[PDB]
PDB file of C-alpha atoms and ligand atoms in Angstrom:
ATOM      1  CA  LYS A   1       8.414   6.521  -0.012  1.00  0.00           C
ATOM      2  CA  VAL A   2       5.585   6.160   2.510  1.00  0.00           C
ATOM      3  CA  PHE A   3       4.144   9.627   2.977  1.00  0.00           C
ATOM      4  CA  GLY A   4       2.753  10.868   6.189  1.00  0.00           C
ATOM      5  CA  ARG A   5      -0.837  12.055   5.969  1.00  0.00           C
ATOM      6  CA  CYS A   6      -0.008  15.779   6.277  1.00  0.00           C
ATOM      7  CA  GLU A   7       3.166  15.460   4.183  1.00  0.00           C
ATOM      8  CA  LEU A   8       1.085  14.149   1.282  1.00  0.00           C
ATOM      9  CA  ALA A   9      -1.636  16.718   1.914  1.00  0.00           C
ATOM     10  CA  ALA A  10       0.874  19.539   1.588  1.00  0.00           C
ATOM     11  CA  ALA A  11       2.481  18.009  -1.495  1.00  0.00           C
ATOM     12  CA  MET A  12      -0.891  17.575  -3.191  1.00  0.00           C
ATOM     13  CA  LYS A  13      -1.918  21.117  -2.410  1.00  0.00           C
ATOM     14  CA  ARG A  14       1.376  22.544  -3.717  1.00  0.00           C
ATOM     15  CA  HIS A  15       0.804  20.602  -6.906  1.00  0.00           C
ATOM     16  CA  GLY A  16      -2.633  22.246  -7.209  1.00  0.00           C
ATOM     17  CA  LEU A  17      -4.922  19.372  -6.305  1.00  0.00           C
ATOM     18  CA  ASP A  18      -6.740  21.253  -3.594  1.00  0.00           C
ATOM     19  CA  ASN A  19     -10.155  21.945  -5.177  1.00  0.00           C
ATOM     20  CA  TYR A  20      -9.150  20.744  -8.680  1.00  0.00           C
ATOM     21  CA  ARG A  21     -12.420  20.154 -10.582  1.00  0.00           C
ATOM     22  CA  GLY A  22     -14.142  20.845  -7.260  1.00  0.00           C
ATOM     23  CA  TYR A  23     -12.541  18.020  -5.285  1.00  0.00           C
ATOM     24  CA  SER A  24     -11.305  19.271  -1.919  1.00  0.00           C
ATOM     25  CA  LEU A  25      -7.865  18.207  -0.639  1.00  0.00           C
ATOM     26  CA  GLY A  26      -9.376  15.704   1.746  1.00  0.00           C
ATOM     27  CA  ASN A  27     -10.783  13.809  -1.250  1.00  0.00           C
ATOM     28  CA  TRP A  28      -7.318  13.385  -2.746  1.00  0.00           C
ATOM     29  CA  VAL A  29      -5.693  12.428   0.571  1.00  0.00           C
ATOM     30  CA  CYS A  30      -8.496   9.930   1.245  1.00  0.00           C
ATOM     31  CA  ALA A  31      -8.194   8.503  -2.254  1.00  0.00           C
ATOM     32  CA  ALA A  32      -4.438   8.052  -1.892  1.00  0.00           C
ATOM     33  CA  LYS A  33      -4.839   6.518   1.583  1.00  0.00           C
ATOM     34  CA  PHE A  34      -7.120   3.807   0.303  1.00  0.00           C
ATOM     35  CA  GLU A  35      -5.545   3.433  -3.158  1.00  0.00           C
ATOM     36  CA  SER A  36      -1.906   3.078  -2.147  1.00  0.00           C
ATOM     37  CA  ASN A  37      -1.684   3.517   1.664  1.00  0.00           C
ATOM     38  CA  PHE A  38       0.400   6.645   0.913  1.00  0.00           C
ATOM     39  CA  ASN A  39       3.006   4.479  -0.783  1.00  0.00           C
ATOM     40  CA  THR A  40       4.451   5.981  -3.937  1.00  0.00           C
ATOM     41  CA  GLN A  41       5.745   2.529  -4.951  1.00  0.00           C
ATOM     42  CA  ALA A  42       2.394   0.752  -4.796  1.00  0.00           C
ATOM     43  CA  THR A  43       1.675  -1.404  -7.843  1.00  0.00           C
ATOM     44  CA  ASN A  44      -1.339  -3.618  -8.343  1.00  0.00           C
ATOM     45  CA  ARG A  45      -2.202  -5.886 -11.248  1.00  0.00           C
ATOM     46  CA  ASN A  46      -5.700  -5.898 -12.687  1.00  0.00           C
ATOM     47  CA  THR A  47      -7.439  -8.966 -14.062  1.00  0.00           C
ATOM     48  CA  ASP A  48      -7.645  -7.332 -17.516  1.00  0.00           C
ATOM     49  CA  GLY A  49      -3.867  -7.304 -17.594  1.00  0.00           C
ATOM     50  CA  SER A  50      -3.390  -3.623 -16.890  1.00  0.00           C
ATOM     51  CA  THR A  51      -1.483  -2.461 -13.821  1.00  0.00           C
ATOM     52  CA  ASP A  52      -2.165   0.392 -11.372  1.00  0.00           C
ATOM     53  CA  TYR A  53       0.818   2.534 -10.466  1.00  0.00           C
ATOM     54  CA  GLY A  54       1.755   4.836  -7.631  1.00  0.00           C
ATOM     55  CA  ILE A  55       0.220   6.808  -4.822  1.00  0.00           C
ATOM     56  CA  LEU A  56      -3.041   7.252  -6.784  1.00  0.00           C
ATOM     57  CA  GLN A  57      -2.928   3.839  -8.538  1.00  0.00           C
ATOM     58  CA  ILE A  58      -3.093   5.200 -12.068  1.00  0.00           C
ATOM     59  CA  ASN A  59      -4.010   2.518 -14.609  1.00  0.00           C
ATOM     60  CA  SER A  60      -1.848   1.456 -17.566  1.00  0.00           C
ATOM     61  CA  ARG A  61      -4.791   0.629 -19.852  1.00  0.00           C
ATOM     62  CA  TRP A  62      -5.420   4.343 -20.398  1.00  0.00           C
ATOM     63  CA  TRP A  63      -2.980   6.702 -18.726  1.00  0.00           C
ATOM     64  CA  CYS A  64       0.623   5.536 -18.783  1.00  0.00           C
ATOM     65  CA  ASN A  65       2.696   3.154 -20.816  1.00  0.00           C
ATOM     66  CA  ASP A  66       4.179   0.101 -19.096  1.00  0.00           C
ATOM     67  CA  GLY A  67       4.712  -1.883 -22.290  1.00  0.00           C
ATOM     68  CA  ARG A  68       2.697  -4.877 -21.174  1.00  0.00           C
ATOM     69  CA  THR A  69      -0.944  -3.829 -21.632  1.00  0.00           C
ATOM     70  CA  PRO A  70      -1.770  -4.683 -25.271  1.00  0.00           C
ATOM     71  CA  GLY A  71      -4.195  -2.183 -26.817  1.00  0.00           C
ATOM     72  CA  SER A  72      -3.597   0.385 -24.076  1.00  0.00           C
ATOM     73  CA  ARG A  73      -3.425   4.130 -24.424  1.00  0.00           C
ATOM     74  CA  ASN A  74      -0.956   6.412 -22.770  1.00  0.00           C
ATOM     75  CA  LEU A  75      -3.019   9.571 -22.529  1.00  0.00           C
ATOM     76  CA  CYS A  76      -0.654  11.060 -19.940  1.00  0.00           C
ATOM     77  CA  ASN A  77       2.267  10.314 -22.334  1.00  0.00           C
ATOM     78  CA  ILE A  78       4.373   8.934 -19.485  1.00  0.00           C
ATOM     79  CA  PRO A  79       6.130   5.658 -18.534  1.00  0.00           C
ATOM     80  CA  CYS A  80       4.209   4.082 -15.690  1.00  0.00           C
ATOM     81  CA  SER A  81       7.483   3.969 -13.713  1.00  0.00           C
ATOM     82  CA  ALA A  82       7.475   7.780 -13.674  1.00  0.00           C
ATOM     83  CA  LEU A  83       4.338   7.475 -11.573  1.00  0.00           C
ATOM     84  CA  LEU A  84       6.315   5.701  -8.800  1.00  0.00           C
ATOM     85  CA  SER A  85       8.859   8.368  -7.963  1.00  0.00           C
ATOM     86  CA  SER A  86       9.226   9.756  -4.485  1.00  0.00           C
ATOM     87  CA  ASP A  87       8.255  12.991  -6.286  1.00  0.00           C
ATOM     88  CA  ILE A  88       4.482  12.912  -6.797  1.00  0.00           C
ATOM     89  CA  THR A  89       4.549  15.592  -9.492  1.00  0.00           C
ATOM     90  CA  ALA A  90       3.885  13.213 -12.388  1.00  0.00           C
ATOM     91  CA  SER A  91       1.121  11.320 -10.609  1.00  0.00           C
ATOM     92  CA  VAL A  92      -0.616  14.592  -9.852  1.00  0.00           C
ATOM     93  CA  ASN A  93      -0.385  15.896 -13.447  1.00  0.00           C
ATOM     94  CA  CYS A  94      -1.823  12.653 -14.688  1.00  0.00           C
ATOM     95  CA  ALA A  95      -4.560  12.608 -12.011  1.00  0.00           C
ATOM     96  CA  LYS A  96      -5.562  16.103 -13.179  1.00  0.00           C
ATOM     97  CA  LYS A  97      -5.911  14.746 -16.679  1.00  0.00           C
ATOM     98  CA  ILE A  98      -7.813  11.688 -15.433  1.00  0.00           C
ATOM     99  CA  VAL A  99     -10.315  13.570 -13.267  1.00  0.00           C
ATOM    100  CA  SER A 100     -11.149  15.888 -16.191  1.00  0.00           C
ATOM    101  CA  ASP A 101     -11.855  13.011 -18.649  1.00  0.00           C
ATOM    102  CA  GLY A 102     -15.567  12.743 -17.809  1.00  0.00           C
ATOM    103  CA  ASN A 103     -16.286  10.756 -14.620  1.00  0.00           C
ATOM    104  CA  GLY A 104     -14.284  12.857 -12.144  1.00  0.00           C
ATOM    105  CA  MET A 105     -12.867  11.037  -9.176  1.00  0.00           C
ATOM    106  CA  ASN A 106     -15.076   8.038  -9.806  1.00  0.00           C
ATOM    107  CA  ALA A 107     -12.045   7.014 -11.872  1.00  0.00           C
ATOM    108  CA  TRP A 108     -10.554   5.851  -8.514  1.00  0.00           C
ATOM    109  CA  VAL A 109     -12.531   2.819  -7.316  1.00  0.00           C
ATOM    110  CA  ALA A 110     -11.283   3.219  -3.740  1.00  0.00           C
ATOM    111  CA  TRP A 111     -12.372   6.848  -3.780  1.00  0.00           C
ATOM    112  CA  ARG A 112     -15.802   5.941  -5.114  1.00  0.00           C
ATOM    113  CA  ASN A 113     -16.291   3.087  -2.632  1.00  0.00           C
ATOM    114  CA  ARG A 114     -14.501   4.481   0.445  1.00  0.00           C
ATOM    115  CA  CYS A 115     -14.226   8.276   0.225  1.00  0.00           C
ATOM    116  CA  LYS A 116     -17.159   9.544  -1.856  1.00  0.00           C
ATOM    117  CA  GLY A 117     -19.822  11.225   0.216  1.00  0.00           C
ATOM    118  CA  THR A 118     -17.946  10.900   3.518  1.00  0.00           C
ATOM    119  CA  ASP A 119     -16.418  13.562   5.731  1.00  0.00           C
ATOM    120  CA  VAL A 120     -13.189  13.754   3.712  1.00  0.00           C
ATOM    121  CA  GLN A 121     -12.143  16.875   5.605  1.00  0.00           C
ATOM    122  CA  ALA A 122     -11.069  14.572   8.440  1.00  0.00           C
ATOM    123  CA  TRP A 123      -8.119  13.622   6.175  1.00  0.00           C
ATOM    124  CA  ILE A 124      -6.506  17.074   6.346  1.00  0.00           C
ATOM    125  CA  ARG A 125      -7.087  17.549  10.065  1.00  0.00           C
ATOM    126  CA  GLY A 126      -4.090  18.832  11.943  1.00  0.00           C
ATOM    127  CA  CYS A 127      -2.047  19.681   8.865  1.00  0.00           C
ATOM    128  CA  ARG A 128      -0.348  23.055   8.789  1.00  0.00           C
ATOM    129  CA  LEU A 129      -1.874  23.777   5.377  1.00  0.00           C
TER     130      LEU A 129
HETATM  131  C1  LIG B 201      -7.132   6.178 -11.767  1.00  0.00           C
HETATM  132  C2  LIG B 201      -7.362   5.271 -12.940  1.00  0.00           C
HETATM  133  O1  LIG B 201      -6.479   5.009 -13.746  1.00  0.00           O
HETATM  134  N1  LIG B 201      -8.577   4.756 -13.039  1.00  0.00           N
HETATM  135  C3  LIG B 201      -8.960   3.840 -14.107  1.00  0.00           C
HETATM  136  C4  LIG B 201     -10.119   4.433 -14.908  1.00  0.00           C
HETATM  137  O2  LIG B 201      -9.658   5.581 -15.608  1.00  0.00           O
HETATM  138  C5  LIG B 201     -10.715   3.420 -15.876  1.00  0.00           C
HETATM  139  O3  LIG B 201     -12.007   3.879 -16.274  1.00  0.00           O
HETATM  140  C6  LIG B 201     -12.183   4.124 -17.640  1.00  0.00           C
HETATM  141  O4  LIG B 201     -11.491   5.329 -17.931  1.00  0.00           O
HETATM  142  C7  LIG B 201     -11.642   5.800 -19.280  1.00  0.00           C
HETATM  143  C8  LIG B 201     -10.818   7.057 -19.322  1.00  0.00           C
HETATM  144  O5  LIG B 201     -11.349   7.827 -18.252  1.00  0.00           O
HETATM  145  C9  LIG B 201     -13.119   6.068 -19.560  1.00  0.00           C
HETATM  146  O6  LIG B 201     -13.254   6.670 -20.863  1.00  0.00           O
HETATM  147  C10 LIG B 201     -14.073   7.807 -20.986  1.00  0.00           C
HETATM  148  O7  LIG B 201     -15.453   7.487 -20.892  1.00  0.00           O
HETATM  149  C11 LIG B 201     -16.306   8.644 -20.783  1.00  0.00           C
HETATM  150  C12 LIG B 201     -17.731   8.143 -20.672  1.00  0.00           C
HETATM  151  O8  LIG B 201     -17.898   7.292 -19.547  1.00  0.00           O
HETATM  152  C13 LIG B 201     -16.157   9.628 -21.946  1.00  0.00           C
HETATM  153  O9  LIG B 201     -16.518  10.943 -21.529  1.00  0.00           O
HETATM  154  C14 LIG B 201     -14.733   9.716 -22.496  1.00  0.00           C
HETATM  155  O10 LIG B 201     -14.746  10.090 -23.870  1.00  0.00           O
HETATM  156  C15 LIG B 201     -13.880   8.456 -22.342  1.00  0.00           C
HETATM  157  N2  LIG B 201     -12.482   8.786 -22.589  1.00  0.00           N
HETATM  158  C16 LIG B 201     -11.789   8.194 -23.539  1.00  0.00           C
HETATM  159  C17 LIG B 201     -10.368   8.642 -23.683  1.00  0.00           C
HETATM  160  O11 LIG B 201     -12.273   7.314 -24.241  1.00  0.00           O
HETATM  161  C18 LIG B 201     -13.840   4.737 -19.378  1.00  0.00           C
HETATM  162  O12 LIG B 201     -15.231   4.863 -19.648  1.00  0.00           O
HETATM  163  C19 LIG B 201     -13.665   4.270 -17.933  1.00  0.00           C
HETATM  164  N3  LIG B 201     -14.367   3.023 -17.650  1.00  0.00           N
HETATM  165  C20 LIG B 201     -15.331   2.954 -16.736  1.00  0.00           C
HETATM  166  C21 LIG B 201     -15.922   1.596 -16.502  1.00  0.00           C
HETATM  167  O13 LIG B 201     -15.717   3.947 -16.116  1.00  0.00           O
HETATM  168  C22 LIG B 201     -10.892   2.014 -15.306  1.00  0.00           C
HETATM  169  C23 LIG B 201     -11.109   0.964 -16.372  1.00  0.00           C
HETATM  170  O14 LIG B 201      -9.969   0.884 -17.225  1.00  0.00           O
HETATM  171  O15 LIG B 201      -9.707   1.613 -14.604  1.00  0.00           O
HETATM  172  C24 LIG B 201      -9.359   2.474 -13.537  1.00  0.00           C
HETATM  173  O16 LIG B 201      -8.343   1.855 -12.814  1.00  0.00           O
HETATM  174 NA1   NA B 202       0.050   2.164 -22.780  1.00  0.00          NA
END
């Protein structure tokens, strides 16, 4: 499913991402926009052999199990396919775990390079939130 900007903003807020670990909702919408283009089915292979899954491109080296990343952890205890559902619940629970692991949202390269320090509030503009 390709979310609309405000549809994803409302889903993320309902799942408690608004202000989680101090990151305002616009940060999460911006991160998803540039990580997956709001596409829950986005998958992207890394050169180290891990894969990024879902709307927030969660990596299989550390967070989910996809069975093809030798030496990988599954700290969110979840199949990576569960991060692709039209329901973003699982991706959000795992992102909460990720952002609390030590480097915050710098875990998302697109967030660090494209969202960090910018006017992320623009991303929730117009949403009936
Ligand atoms: C959204 C996503 O999946 N992003 C991936 C990143 O999570 C990943 O970065 C590496 O993540 C692990 C887990 O967060 C980092 O480990 C932690 O390191 C810090 C110190 O920097 C320490 O506090 C923690 O103890 C330690 N946790 C564990 C469980 O060991 C690791 O350092 C991150 N690497 C870098 C370069 O920042 C990267 C790389 O796999 O991929 C993203 O896609
Ligand atoms: Na794994």
